[PDB]
Write a protein that binds this ligand. Structure first.
Ligand SMILES: Nc1ncnc2[nH]cnc12
Ligand SMILES: Nc1ncnc2[nH]cnc12
Lengths: 228, 227
């Protein structure tokens, strides 16, 4: 809207090909840069200058990709798109969650008095940018947690639910992207779509619906770009 | 020559206590602040080095290592610092040279990967065999990495059962190894023990982090004379 800040160069990150393929196919003559085991596609998409990033899976790869995206291309914000596992009551496959904030669910330095999920020298949560959140809303909103585990065992899900009763979904990169953006002081947002639901044949669900999750998340991003 | 030479050496430590001696023996270092990390360039014990203060944990170490590699392109990366000891005959102040790094907290085994193996990565990140030999001339084996301070009994027991040959744990080594794998750069992790599994690890850590970080860094300084 008129009173909102502007974002002239948009960085977009997805972990897997299934999460970036559609977005890439809608870019105009994209340049490709291979670096650090990641890929960066530079060009125009839905009327915006963007750098689309295929990061690889997990906290470390996401961190590499985001570091290089920021240091080499300096976008004005970062949007993470992709798939996630649903925890909240009324989530179904393909449903979209917009993160108001990211936390790590597997970080534990509580022995030194940090909150569960809080990394030393870091805030306990990484809030997504107030403008980006509202733009996504205009196109559920809440906490998504990140960890380097694919969560499908009853004990793991129960513990995560106990540590984070308000967690709506789980995935493997969003809070790493948020921490890197915090360290560079760059606005970010995470949008994810459910490829599987906690407790419900999650391996087979993920294999079957990763592509529809990646698609629904990417469609949201395309509409967001239309409004930035 | 035909010698296995590393001309520009990256060195990375998580905390001020792990890098302070190294920096203090550098000849008029230049300082750069980027991505929440610090990079000091200069000469040290005769060698061209970039010393990096990364911060704690996998994400911070990954940022630090990826910036170090892309902006400075060292010929090898050596990680130094403190760790928690699991091996039977390990004690406060003992040094461990990593043969390879693994993650103890990564679990995508539902998709067929080994325990500790992240999807799209190798199960383990072997340290460069030349760097290992140099370090030895100045225990050798597996160190595991996770984003947790391992002191609760059930967590120590799970890690021991998952990785029976794990000698020690810390919070950055395998991330550094993964980034170096992603960039194809040789690396090595060297740690000194600030605490031992099962033995008042919080108080031990606070009391021994300074001297353990110094001990590890002193190995590194020895190494740089022979590289
Ligand atoms: N169940 C799950 N756990 C972790 N990351 C996921 N991404 C999609 N589904 C997931
Ligand atoms: N017990 C421990 N767990 C994790 N990282 C450590 N670094 C030093 N001691 C440690």
């Amino acid at each position: 809207g008129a009173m909102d800040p502007e974002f002239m160069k948009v960085g977009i990150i997805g972990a897997m090909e299934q999460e970036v393929a559609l977005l890439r196919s809608q870019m105009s003559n994209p340049t490709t840069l291979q670096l650090g085991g990641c890929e960066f596609y530079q060009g125009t998409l839905a009327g915006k200058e963007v750098i689309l990033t295929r990061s690889g899976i997990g906290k470390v790869a996401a961190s590499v990709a985001t570091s290089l995206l920021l240091e080499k291309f300096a976008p004005d914000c970062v949007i993470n798109t992709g798939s996630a596992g649903g925890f909240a009551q009324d989530l179904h496959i393909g449903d979209v969650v917009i993160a108001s904030e990211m936390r790590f669910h597997d970080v534990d330095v509580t022995a030194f008095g940090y909150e569960m999920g809080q990394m030393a020298q870091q805030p306990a949560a990484f809030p997504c940018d107030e403008t980006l959140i509202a733009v996504a809303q205009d196109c559920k909103v809440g906490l998504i947690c990140t960890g380097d585990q694919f969560m499908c065992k009853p004990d793991a899900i129960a513990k995560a639910r106990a540590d984070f009763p308000q967690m709506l979904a789980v995935e493997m990169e969003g809070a790493a992207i948020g921490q890197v953006c915090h360290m560079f002081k760059v606005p970010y947002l995470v949008v994810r779509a459910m490829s599987d639901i906690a407790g419900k044949e999650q391996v087979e669900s993920f294999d079957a619906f990763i592509e529809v999750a990646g698609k629904h998340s990417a469609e949201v991003i395309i509409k967001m770009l239309g409004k930035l």
